[PDB]
Design a protein around this nucleic acid. Structure first.
Ligand SMILES: Nc1ncnc2c1ncn2[C@@H]1O[C@H](COP(=O)(O)OP(=O)(O)OP(=O)(O)O)[C@@H](O)[C@H]1O
Ligand SMILES: Nc1ncnc2c1ncn2[C@@H]1O[C@H](COP(=O)(O)OP(=O)(O)OP(=O)(O)O)[C@@H](O)[C@H]1O
Ligand SMILES: Nc1ncnc2c1ncn2[C@@H]1O[C@H](COP(=O)(O)OP(=O)(O)OP(=O)(O)O)[C@@H](O)[C@H]1O
Ligand SMILES: [Mg+2]
Ligand SMILES: [Mg+2]
Ligand SMILES: [Mg+2]
Lengths: 606, 362, 97, 54, 433
DNA sequence: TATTGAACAGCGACCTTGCCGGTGCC
DNA sequence: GGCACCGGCAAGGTCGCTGTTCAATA
C-alpha cells in the first residue's frame, strides 16, 4: 500500500526538472544525391594561377603605362655545370665537383680504374676473359671493315706498337728544361669571395694535389645522370654538397658575392627528359629555401635543344659524359613515350680507351683514374686522339707528360693503332664498357618517387621506348611497386642506332609518314658527341639498319653554328627571355604549396 | 553567390582564406600587443614592440584569453581578408580534445560579435586527413605549441586513443637558442628569438641515425652551415643542426619526461581496436609546421618499423602541402555542396544558444 | 530518521524501475541509431572530401588540350624570337687569351 | 551552374540571413534543480531574453 | 520560460579500475580520457598517462587501486582524478605575460557520477564522496556499481552480467536496474590471473621462452619460426626498477591475450579424451615478441585459458605464494552459484538477457564456450548473449552505461546535492540504493 | 586564307537515393 | 497488423567526352 499525500508530507516527490526525456544528441542524415563541389573549379581559386593572372594583368597595366640580367640559367651535369645570366652570349662552364678537408683521398678509399685483378692468371684473368675476347673480335671486325671499304691494313700492326710501348721507359726534365707550369691550389689561403669555409669547386678543386698539409677529398654529387648516392654516407650530406657546390658557383663564377642580393634574381634549371622527380624537387628546394631566388622554371634537355636551334620538330640525341639520352620533340612537347636513357657517354670512352691501351702495354701501367692528375691526363688523351673517322687511321706515335704533384715531371712516348676508333665505336656494342658497377647504390639513400596520396604507386615518368630497351637486355599478379623494383634492377643499355630507331618507332606510334619526317631530323647535342665524324657515322649506322628509310636519313650536329655543349643552355636562355612563358614557380607559391605547384605550372604532364 | 570563409587559428600563425581556394590569403602571427602604460596584431605588433606588452591568446593549441582572441578575428576579417563576415558562412578549426567550453565560446563570438549567417567548428586532425586524400589513418599533427597523435577510422576520430606530446616547434627553437649559446653566441631577447626561429626553418634536419651523425660530426666540414644575421654578422652552426630536431625523438635531450613522436604514435595505434590497427600502420599521416624538417618522413618510417611486428606494412604519408593541410582540408569541406546541411545557421543559434555546437559539430 | 521510511523505499524503487524499463530502453535505441547515422555521415563526407583532394591530379581531355595549346604557344613565340634575332643579325663571341 | 540549382539541393544557401539583424545574445545564467527528496541546487545554464510577438 | 537553450546538465562520468581509469562527459558514445591506473613516481612527484611512463633513473611504477578493484591510496587517487577531471577536461589558465619570451574551485558546473566495484565496502564509499566534496567544489555527486551500468550499456533493465575484468571476474544479477545482493559472485580467474598462466606456460616450454619488454630493444631483424633472436638492446646509466619492467612486460602479455589465446569452444572441456589430442593437429597461431623472436603456438593457446572453465587444467603459479584456483572460482561455478542466489521464477528472464563485459571477455571463442556451458548446465531454456556497447568497440562497457544514465532526464532527481551532503555527511549509504 | 581561343550544344557514365518488393520479427 | 533488413530497380543531374560554330589573328 502506497499514497502520494504521505510522500508529500515526507518531502518526497518524483520530478522531471523541466528536462527533455533524453539529452542524447539526435543526428540527421546527410543527403548526397547529385552532389556538386566547388573545390579548385576556377583559375581564380588556384594559387599558382591566381598569381599568374595578377602578374599578366600588372604587365598589361605596365603596357598602358622582365630584365634578362636578373635571370640565372643553370644546367647541371655529371662532369660539367653550365651557369650564366640569361643576358649573356655563353655560360661559364665549370667541373661539377666539390673539394673539402677529409681523412682520405678518392684514390685511398677505392680500387683503381680501369678495373684490373693485378694478381691473376695472365692478361686473360687480369682484364677478364670475355672482355679480352670482345676486344679481339672488334679488332678483327675493323680490319674486315677497312678491307671491305678498300683501305690499306698492314698484315701485322699491334706487334709494331706493343713492342715499342713496353720497352720505351720515361724521361725527366722539369727542373731545368721549360715545361707548361701547372699551379696546384694553395689550400691554406683564405677565400676572398665572401665566405669563411676553405672549400673548393671546379678547376681549383681538381688541381688540389694528392698530398697537402690538410688532406682534401673530391666529391661529385651527380654521376651517370643521377644523384650520386653510391658515394655518400647519408642523404643530408648529399643535399648539403649539391647546395655548397651551386652556392660557390654563384659567388665564384657569376660574382654575385653578397648573399642578401640574391632575392632579386630568378632561375632557369634544365633537367633530363626522364627525370627522377626527387631530383627536380631537390633543385627547386635549393633555389627557393637556401638561395631564396624570386622565381624558378624548368625545361627538359631535349625541349631546350630545339629552342636553341629554332626547330618545331626534331629527334634529339644527347651524348653526355655518362648519360646518353634520346627523345623526339614535336609541337612544343617532348613526345612522352619516345624517351630513352642509356647509361653511357664520353667518360666510358675515356675508361675504355685507357683500358684498351693498358692491355696493349701502355707504358704508364700504374695509371688509376681516381687520382686527379691521372683523370685529367686520361680526359686530355681522349679528346686529342679518339676518332670515328675511319680513313685517317694508321700506326701513330705521340707523347704525354705526367705532371704528378711534388715530383719531377715524367715524359712518356707511346704508340697507338686502333684503340682510338674501337673505344668510341663502343656506342654500337656497349658490352665493352665497364657497366659492372653503374647500378650499385641506385636506391641506397633516396627512394623511388611515389605519388603523394598513394604511396605504393610510383610517380616517376615512364616510356614505352625505355621499357622496350629493358626488355632487350632482360626479357620481361604483382604490384606496380614490385614491377618497378624489377625494372630498377636492370641497367638500361643498348646500341645507339637501335636506341634511336626504338625511340622513333614509339614516337611515330605506327605511322610511316611521322617516321619519315623524324628520321630526316636527327639533331646531335652534348659534349660526348664532339668526337670527330660522330654525326656521319651515326647516319651510316642507321642507313645500313633501315633500307626503307636510307635515302631520307639526315643527321646534323648542333644548331646555328653553336658549340654542341651550349645548345641546350642557349635554348634555356631563350625560354627565360620570351614573353609567353608562364612556367615560373614563384617564391611565394613554393613557400605555400611546395612541389605541388610544379604540377600546376610546367609545360608538360609532370 | 559568395563562398564561405575558412579560419585556421593556432599557437603560432593564424591562416585565413576563401572556401574552394587551394591556399590561404592571409598568414600572420597570433600575437596581440597592448600599450603597457588601441591594440595591435601580427607583424604590426612586432614592429612597434617597444611601447607594447605582447601576448599569445592561444597556448598549447587552446584559446586561453578570449578578449585578445576576438581582436585576432577582427583583424582577420577586416584588415587581412577585407570582407564583412555577415555576408559569409564561416569554418573554424579546433584542436583535438580541446575543452567543451571553448567550442561554446567561439560559437558565441562569431554569431554575437560578427553576425555571421552560418558556421561550423572542425577538428584539425580530421581536416588534415581529408587533405591527404584518405578516410582512415593516424595523424601525427605537430605545430608551434603542441603535438598530437590522432587515430581516425572511416572519418571518425577516436578520442580515447589521442595522445598529446606537449612539446613542439617553440621548444625546438628555445632548445636551439640554448645549444647555440653553448657554441659562444648569444640570443636571449625576442629580437634574437625571431632570428633563431628562421635558423631552424632553413638549416635544421632530422638525422637518420643519430649515433652515426653525432660521431661523424667531429670530422664533417659539410655539416657546418653558415648564416648571415640582420646585422651582417655571420654565424656558423654544426651538430646543432640535427641536435635540435632530435628532441622530437628524444625529449630527454631538452629535459622532460615523455616518449618521442615514434613511441607516442605506436602507443596510440596500440590503444585502438585490434582489427583497425593494420589499416592505421598503412596510413600514418604527417601534419603541421613542425613536421616539415628534411628527413622526418624517413626517420618516422624507420622508428615505427622498429617498434611494429615484422608482419605489418608501415607507410608514412607526408604530402608537400602539409604545413597548411589543416586549412586545405577545411577549404575542401566548406566547398562541397553538402556543407549546407552540416552548418549551424544563425536561426538555430537564436533558437538554441551556444550549446548547439555539441549537437551539430559532432 | 531520513532515508528509511516505506515511502522512501517505494519512490526510490519506482524511479529506478521506470528509468530502467522505459527511459534506458528508448535512449539505447536512439543512441545506437544516432551513432550509426553519425558514423555514416562521416564516412560519406570523408569519401567525398578525399576524392576532391585528389581530383586535381586526374588527367582530362580538356586539360590535355589546354596544355598542348600552352606548349604550342610558347613554341611559336620561340620561333618568332628567332625571326627577330635573325632579321637583326645577333652576334655572340670573342675568345682571345 | 550548380549553386543556382533550385529544389532541395541548395535549401541551405537560400535560407541564409546574409547582412541581417543581430541574433539574440546569450549569458551564463543559473537554473534550479530539485532532487526527489525535495532539495534544491544550482547548475550554470545558457540563457537569453525572450522573443515576443504582438 | 523559453529563456534556456539546448543546454541541460553536463555530467562528468568517472570509472576507476585496477588496470585502466576512464573519464569523460555524459552524452557521448565513448570516454574522452582513458589512462593506466599505474602512475609513475620520480624524485617525489607523481606522473600520469601512458605517454609519460618512460625509462628514467629511479622510476617507480605504482597503482592507486588494489586487486579488490578498490582504492587503496586516496592521496594518489586524488591527484589522478584531479589530472583527469580538471587538467585535461577544463579550460587552461593562461601563462603570465612576462614568461612567454615576447616581452624581453575547479568543477563548479559539472556534476560527477563515479563507478564502484559491486563489493565496494561502506567505509570506502563514504571516503569517495568525502574526497569529492572537499577537493573540487563539484555541485552534486552519484556513485553506482559497474554491473548496473554494464546492463544499461546493453539496453537491458533486467540481466545477468558476466564481467571478466582485470583483477576480478564478477557475475551479478541486475533486476529493474538494481543489483540483487545475494547474487554477487567474484573470482581471481580474470585478466591478471591469465597473464600469470601465460608467464608460467612460457617458463615451461622445452626451450624456455623469455619476454623482454618493448623499451629494452633498440633495433631488431626478422627471424624464422623458433630461431634464436637477432637484436641489440638498450643500455642505461641506472638500474631499471623491477616494478617498471613488470608494467612494461604487461603490454606484451596483452598482445598475446588479444591475438593468440583462444578459449576451447568445442564439445565438452579441452581435457576430455579426444579434444586435447585433436587440438595438437590443428593449424596454430603465429606471434612475435618485441625481441624479434617468432614462434607458432598450437595446443598451449587453449590450456592457458581453459583453467578458468576447469581448474584441473591450470599451470602452476609462477609466484610460489599465490593460491591456485579452486572449483568454486571457475566461471561455470560462479554462474551456477550466482543464479542459485536468485528466485527460481526469475531465472529464465535473466538467462534470456545475458550481458557480457570487460576486456577478458574479448578472448576468441569466449562467447561460444559461455553459450555451450550455459546450455549444458541449464537445459530447456533459451540462452542469448549480448555485448555491452553501442559499437563493436566493447572495452568501455561500464563507462558507456554511465554516459547514458547521466543523459536521461529522469535521472537528475537522484544526484546527492552538495547541500544534501553538507547537511548529513553519511547520506551516501542510504540515499543511493 | 589556315589556324586559333573560345562559347555553345549534345550525349553517356556515373553515384546515390527512394521505391516496390520478399522475407521476417514481434 | 507495424516496423525492419536486405535486395533489384528506375531515375536524377553533374561531370567529362564529343562536336559545331563563331570572331579574331597575320
Ligand atoms: N673537344 C672534345 N672532344 C671530345 N669529347 C669532348 C670534348 N670536350 C669534352 N668532351 C667530352 O664530352 C663529355 C661530355 O661533357 P658534357 O658536359 O656534355 O657532359 P655533362 O653534360 O657534364 O654530363 P652528362 O653526361 O650528365 O650530360 C665530357 O665528359 C668529355 O669526356
Ligand atoms: N620549413 C620548416 N622547417 C621547420 N620548421 C618549420 C618550417 N616551417 C615552419 N616551421 C615551424 O612550424 C611551426 C609553426 O607550425 P604551425 O603553423 O602548424 O603552427 P600552428 O598551427 O599555429 O601550431 P598549433 O597547430 O600547434 O597551434 C613553427 O615552430 C615554425 O618555426
Ligand atoms: N583485447 C583484449 N583481449 C583480452 N584481454 C584484454 C584485451 N585488452 C586488454 N585485456 C586485459 O583485460 C583487462 C582490461 O582491463 P578491464 O577494463 O577489462 O578491467 P578494468 O575494468 O580496468 O579493471 P577491473 O578488473 O578493476 O574492473 C586487463 O587485465 C588486460 O590485460
Ligand atoms: Mg649534360
Ligand atoms: Mg596547427
Ligand atoms: Mg572494470
Amino acid at each position: 500500500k502506497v499514497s502520494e499525500r504521505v510522500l508529500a508530507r515526507e518531502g518526497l516527490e518524483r520530478t522531471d526538472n523541466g528536462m527533455r526525456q533524453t539529452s542524447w544528441p539526435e543526428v540527421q542524415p546527410i543527403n548526397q544525391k547529385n552532389y556538386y563541389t566547388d573545390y579548385m573549379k576556377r583559375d581564380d581559386q588556384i594559387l599558382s594561377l591566381r598569381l599568374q593572372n595578377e602578374a599578366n594583368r600588372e604587365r598589361l597595366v605596365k603596357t598602358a603605362q622582365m630584365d634578362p640580367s636578373k635571370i640565372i640559367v643553370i644546367h647541371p651535369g655529371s662532369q660539367n655545370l653550365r651557369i650564366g645570366f640569361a643576358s649573356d652570349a655563353l655560360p661559364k662552364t665549370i667541373p661539377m665537383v666539390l673539394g673539402t678537408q677529409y681523412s682520405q683521398t678518392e684514390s685511398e678509399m677505392h680500387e683503381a680504374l680501369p678495373r684490373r685483378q693485378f694478381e691473376g692468371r695472365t692478361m686473360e684473368q687480369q682484364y677478364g676473359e670475355e672482355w679480352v675476347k670482345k676486344y679481339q673480335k672488334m679488332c678483327s671486325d675493323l680490319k674486315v671493315t677497312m678491307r671491305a671499304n678498300k683501305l690499306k691494313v698492314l698484315p701485322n700492326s699491334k706487334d709494331l706498337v706493343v713492342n715499342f710501348n713496353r720497352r720505351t721507359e720515361p724521361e725527366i726534365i722539369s727542373q731545368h728544361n721549360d715545361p707548361l707550369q701547372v699551379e696546384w691550389t694553395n689550400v691554406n689561403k683564405a677565400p676572398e669571395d665572401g665566405t669563411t669555409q676553405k672549400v673548393f669547386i671546379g678547376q681549383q678543386a681538381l688541381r688540389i694535389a694528392e698530398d697537402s698539409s690538410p688532406k682534401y677529398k673530391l666529391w661529385w654529387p651527380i654521376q651517370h645522370g643521377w644523384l650520386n648516392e653510391d658515394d655518400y654516407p647519408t642523404r643530408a650530406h648529399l643535399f648539403d654538397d649539391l647546395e655548397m657546390l651551386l652556392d660557390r658557383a654563384l659567388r665564384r663564377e657569376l660574382g654575385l658575392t653578397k648573399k642578401a642580393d640574391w632575392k632579386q634574381y630568378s632561375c632557369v634549371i634544365v633537367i633530363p627528359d626522364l627525370y627522377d622527380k626527387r631530383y627536380v624537387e631537390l633543385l627547386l628546394h635549393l633555389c627557393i629555401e637556401f638561395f631564396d631566388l624570386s622565381r624558378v622554371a624548368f625545361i627538359q634537355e631535349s625541349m631546350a635543344a630545339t629552342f636553341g636551334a629554332g626547330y618545331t620538330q626534331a629527334c634529339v640525341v644527347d651524348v653526355g659524359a655518362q648519360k646518353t639520352s634520346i627523345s623526339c620533340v614535336e609541337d612544343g612537347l617532348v613526345i612522352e613515350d619516345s624517351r630513352v636513357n642509356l647509361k653511357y657517354g664520353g667518360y666510358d670512352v675515356t675508361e675504355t680507351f685507357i683500358k684498351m691501351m693498358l692491355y696493349d702495354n701502355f707504358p704508364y701501367q700504374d695509371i688509376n683514374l681516381r687520382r686527379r692528375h691521372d683523370f685529367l691526363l686520361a680526359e686530355e688523351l681522349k679528346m686529342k686522339y679518339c676518332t670515328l673517322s675511319q680513313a685517317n687511321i694508321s700506326v701513330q706515335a705521340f707523347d704525354f707528360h705526367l705532371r704528378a704533384p711534388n715530383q719531377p715531371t715524367r715524359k712518356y712516348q707511346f704508340k697507338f693503332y686502333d684503340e682510338v676508333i674501337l673505344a668510341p665505336m663502343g656506342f654500337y656494342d656497349p658490352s665493352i664498357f665497364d657497366n659492372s658497377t653503374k647500378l650499385r647504390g641506385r636506391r641506397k639513400l633516396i627512394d623511388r618517387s611515389y605519388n603523394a596520396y598513394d604511396v605504393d604507386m610510383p610517380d616517376d615518368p615512364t616510356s614505352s621506348a625505355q621499357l622496350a630497351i629493358l626488355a632487350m637486355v632482360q626479357p620481361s599478379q604483382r604490384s606496380a611497386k614490385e614491377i618497378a623494383a624489377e625494372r630498377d634492377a636492370v641497367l638500361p643499355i643498348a646500341p645507339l642506332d637501335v636506341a634511336i630507331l626504338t625511340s622513333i618507332q614509339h614516337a611515330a606510334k605506327g605511322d610511316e609518314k611521322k617516321v619519315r619526317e623524324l628520321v630526316g631530323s636527327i639533331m646531335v647535342v652534348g659534349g660526348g658527341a664532339k668526337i670527330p665524324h660522330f654525326a656521319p657515322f651515326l647516319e651510316e649506322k642507321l642507313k645500313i639498319r633501315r633500307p626503307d628509310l636510307a635515302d631520307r636519313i639526315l643527321v646534323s650536329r648542333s644548331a646555328r653554328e653553336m658549340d654542341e655543349q651550349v645548345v641546350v643552355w642557349k635554348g634555356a636562355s631563350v625560354f627565360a627571355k620570351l614573353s609567353t612563358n608562364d612556367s615560373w614557380v614563384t617564391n611565394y607559391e613554393y613557400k605555400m604549396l611546395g612541389s605541388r605547384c610544379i604540377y600546376m605550372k610546367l609545360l608538360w604532364h609532370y | 553567390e559568395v563562398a564561405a570563409l575558412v579560419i585556421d587559428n593556432g599557437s603560432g600563425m593564424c591562416k585565413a582564406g576563401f572556401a574552394g581556394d587551394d591556399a590561404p590569403r592571409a598568414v600572420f602571427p597570433s600575437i596581440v600587443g597592448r600599450p603597457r602604460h588601441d591594440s595591435y596584431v601580427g607583424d604590426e605588433a612586432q614592429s612597434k614592440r617597444g611601447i607594447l606588452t605582447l601576448r599569445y591568446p592561444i597556448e598549447h593549441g587552446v584559446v586561453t584569453n578570449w578578449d585578445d582572441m576576438e581582436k585576432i578575428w577582427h583583424h582577420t576579417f577586416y584588415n587581412e581578408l577585407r570582407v564583412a563576415p555577415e555576408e559569409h558562412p564561416v569554418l573554424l578549426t579546433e584542436a583535438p580534445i580541446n575543452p567543451k567550453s571553448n567550442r561554446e565560446k567561439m560559437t558565441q563570438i562569431v554569431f554575437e560579435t560578427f553576425n555571421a549567417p552560418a558556421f561550423y567548428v572542425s577538428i584539425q586532425a580530421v581536416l588534415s586527413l581529408y587533405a591527404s586524400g584518405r578516410t582512415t589513418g593516424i595523424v601525427l599533427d605537430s605545430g608551434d605549441g603542441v603535438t598530437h597523435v590522432v587515430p581516425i577510422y572511416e572519418g571518425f576520430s577516436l578520442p580515447h586513443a589521442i595522445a598529446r606530446l606537449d612539446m613542439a616547434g617553440r621548444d625546438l627553437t628555445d632548445y636551439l637558442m640554448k645549444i647555440l649559446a653553448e657554441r659562444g653566441y648569444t640570443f636571449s631577447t625576442t629580437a634574437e628569438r625571431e632570428i633563431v626561429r628562421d635558423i631552424k626553418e632553413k638549416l635544421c634536419y632530422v638525422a637518420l641515425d643519430f649515433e652515426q651523425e653525432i660521431q661523424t660530426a667531429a670530422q664533417s666540414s659539410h655539416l657546418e652551415k653558415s648564416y648571415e644575421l640582420p646585422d651582417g654578422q655571420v654565424i656558423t652552426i654544426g651538430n646543432e643542426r640535427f641536435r635540435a630536431p632530435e628532441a622530437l625523438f628524444q625529449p630527454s635531450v631538452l629535459g622532460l619526461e615523455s616518449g618521442g613522436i615514434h613511441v607516442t604514435t605506436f602507443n596510440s595505434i596500440m590503444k585502438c581496436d585490434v582489427d583497425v590497427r593494420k589499416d592505421l600502420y598503412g596510413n600514418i599521416v604527417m601534419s603541421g609546421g613542425t613536421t616539415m624538417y628534411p628527413g622526418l618522413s624517413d626517420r618516422m618510417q624507420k622508428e615505427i618499423t622498429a617498434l611494429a611486428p615484422s608482419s605489418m606494412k608501415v607507410k608514412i604519408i607526408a604530402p608537400p602541402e602539409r604545413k597548411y593541410s589543416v586549412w586545405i582540408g577545411g577549404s575542401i569541406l566548406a566547398s562541397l555542396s553538402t556543407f549546407q546541411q552540416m552548418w549551424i545557421s544563425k536561426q538555430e543559434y537564436d533558437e538554441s544558444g551556444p550549446s548547439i555546437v555539441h549537437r551539430k559539430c559532432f | 530518521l531520513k532515508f528509511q521510511s516505506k515511502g522512501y523505499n517505494q519512490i526510490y524503487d519506482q524511479i529506478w524501475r521506470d528509468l530502467a524499463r522505459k527511459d534506458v530502453s528508448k535512449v539505447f535505441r536512439l543512441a545506437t541509431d544516432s551513432y550509426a547515422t553519425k558514423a555514416s555521415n562521416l564516412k560519406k563526407t570523408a569519401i567525398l572530401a578525399s576524392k576532391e583532394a585528389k581530383r586535381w591530379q586526374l588527367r582530362t581531355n580538356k586539360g590535355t588540350k589546354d596544355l598542348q595549346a600552352r606548349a604550342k604557344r610558347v613554341m611559336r613565340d620561340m620561333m618568332g624570337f628567332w625571326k627577330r634575332n635573325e632579321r637583326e643579325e645577333r652576334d655572340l663571341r670573342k675568345a682571345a687569351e | 551552374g550548380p549553386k543556382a540549382n533550385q529544389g532541395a539541393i541548395n535549401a541551405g544557401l537560400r535560407a541564409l540571413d546574409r547582412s541581417g539583424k543581430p541574433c539574440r545574445k546569450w549569458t551564463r545564467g543559473t537554473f534550479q534543480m530539485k532532487s526527489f527528496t525535495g532539495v534544491v541546487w544550482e547548475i550554470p545554464r545558457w540563457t537569453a531574453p525572450p522573443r515576443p510577438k504582438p | 520560460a523559453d529563456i534556456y537553450g539546448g543546454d541541460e546538465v553536463s555530467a562528468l562520468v568517472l570509472d576507476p579500475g585496477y588496470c585502466n581509469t576512464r573519464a569523460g562527459f555524459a552524452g557521448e558514445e565513448m570516454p574522452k580520457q582513458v589512462i593506466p591506473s599505474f602512475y609513475g613516481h620520480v624524485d617525489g612527484r607523481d606522473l600520469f598517462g601512458d605517454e609519460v611512463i618512460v625509462p628514467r633513473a629511479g622510476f617507480e611504477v605504482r597503482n592507486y587501486m588494489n586487486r579488490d578493484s578498490m582504492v587503496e591510496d586516496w592521496d594518489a587517487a586524488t591527484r589522478v582524478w584531479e589530472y583527469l577531471l580538471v587538467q585535461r577536461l577544463q579550460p587552461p589558465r593562461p601563462t603570465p605575460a612576462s614568461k612567454n619570451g615576447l616581452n624581453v574551485k575547479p568543477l563548479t558546473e559539472n556534476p560527477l557520477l563515479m563507478t564502484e566495484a559491486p563489493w565496494n565496502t561502506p567505509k570506502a564509499r563514504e571516503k569517495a564522496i568525502e574526497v569529492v566534496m572537499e577537493n573540487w567544489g563539484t555541485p552534486a555527486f552519484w556513485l553506482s556499481r559497474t554491473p548496473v551500468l554494464a546492463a544499461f550499456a546493453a539496453g537491458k533493465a533486467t540481466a545477468l552480467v558476466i564481467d571478466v575484468g582485470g583483477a576480478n571476474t564478477s557475475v551479478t544479477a541486475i533486476h529493474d536496474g538494481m543489483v540483487l545482493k545475494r547474487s554477487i559472485q567474484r573470482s581471481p580467474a580474470a585478466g591478471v590471473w591469465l597473464s600469470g598462466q601465460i608467464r608460467s606456460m612460457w617458463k615451461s616450454q622445452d626451450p624456455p621462452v623469455n619476454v623482454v619488454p618493448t623499451f629494452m630493444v633498440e633495433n631488431k631483424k626478422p627471424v624464422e619460426a623458433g630461431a634464436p633472436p637477432d637484436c641489440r638492446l638498450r643500455n642505461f646509466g641506472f638500474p631499471i626498477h623491477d616494478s617498471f619492467r613488470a608494467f612494461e612486460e604487461e603490454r606484451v602479455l596483452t598482445e598475446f591475450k588479444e591475438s593468440v589465446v583462444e578459449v576451447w569452444r568445442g564439445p565438452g572441456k579441452y581435457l576430455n579424451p579426444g579434444n586435447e589430442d585433436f587440438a595438437k593437429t590443428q593449424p596454430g597461431r603465429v606471434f612475435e615478441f618485441p625481441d624479434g623472436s617468432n614462434q607458432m603456438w598450437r595446443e598451449q593457446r587453449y590450456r592457458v585459458a581453459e583453467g578458468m572453465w576447469d581448474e584441473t587444467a591450470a599451470y602452476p603459479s609462477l609466484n610460489p605464494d599465490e593460491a591456485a584456483i579452486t572449483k568454486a572460482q571457475t566461471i561455470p561455478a560462479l554462474i551456477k552459484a550466482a543464479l542459485d542466489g536468485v528466485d527460481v521464477d526469475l531465472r529464465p528472464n535473466l538467462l534470456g538477457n545475458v550481458v557480457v563485459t570487460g576486456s577478458t571477455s574479448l578472448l576468441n571463442g569466449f562467447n561460444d564456450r559461455l553459450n555451450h556451458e550455459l546450455t549444458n548446465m541449464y537445459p530447456g531454456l533459451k540462452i542469448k548473449l549480448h555485448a555491452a556497447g553501442l559499437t563493436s568497440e566493447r572495452r568501455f562497457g561500464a563507462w558507456i552505461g554511465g554516459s547514458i544514465l547521466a543523459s536521461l532526464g529522469t535521472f537528475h532527481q537522484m544526484w546527492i546535492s552538495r547541500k544534501e551532503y553538507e547537511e548529513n555527511g553519511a547520506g551516501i549509504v542510504e540515499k543511493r540504493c
